[PDB]
Ligand binder design. Structure first.
Ligand SMILES: O=C(O)CCc1cccc(-c2ncnc3c2ncn3[C@@H]2O[C@H](COP(=O)(O)O)[C@@H](O)[C@H]2O)c1
Length: 134
């Protein structure tokens, strides 16, 4: 079930959670915790995303994903932080899967604000399934 040989060197964060709820330090904390667990599991995600920006609303998804595709050669993944149930999820999947062919992984804001080994493990397993056997 689990894939070896994944190395995620070029990846982006698109934060659809409001900055006042999911701060720069929450993003840095979450990213560092994800770096360490993904590494321990032999699917290392490098500590520094090439891009980390806030956006709001489903209409921002296509412009930002077009920008990412146009700017970052060898981009392997966009981690999308969502604030609860939101039409932004459907739009991220429409643009990523059907328009631009860009791998995306969505995560709940509450799991970025406060991490646990179990929820970082849940996320690594979803990423592994996506980026494994390409
Ligand atoms: O339009 C509306 O009013 C709400 C629409 C709606 C209906 C059903 C589900 C959603 C939805 N909203 C936000 N996050 C969602 C979601 N469905 C799944 N997710 C998130 O995406 C993650 C899965 O990400 P990937 O599909 O990239 O593996 C789930 O863990 C969960 O964290 C949104």
């Amino acid at each position: 079930q689990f894939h070896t040989g994944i190395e995620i060197k070029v990846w982006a964060i698109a934060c659809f959670a409001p900055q006042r709820q999911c701060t720069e330090v929450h993003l840095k904390s979450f990213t560092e915790q994800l770096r360490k667990i993904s590494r321990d599991a032999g699917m290392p995600i490098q500590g520094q995303p090439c891009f980390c920006k806030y956006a709001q609303g489903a209409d921002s998804v296509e412009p930002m994903f077009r920008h990412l595709k146009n700017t970052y050669a060898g981009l392997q993944l966009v981690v999308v932080i969502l604030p609860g149930k939101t039409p932004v999820y459907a739009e991220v999947k429409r643009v990523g899967d059907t328009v631009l062919g860009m791998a995306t992984q969505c995560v709940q804001m509450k799991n970025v604000q406060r991490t646990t080994p179990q929820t970082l493990s849940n996320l690594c397993l979803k990423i592994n399934v996506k980026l494994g056997g390409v």
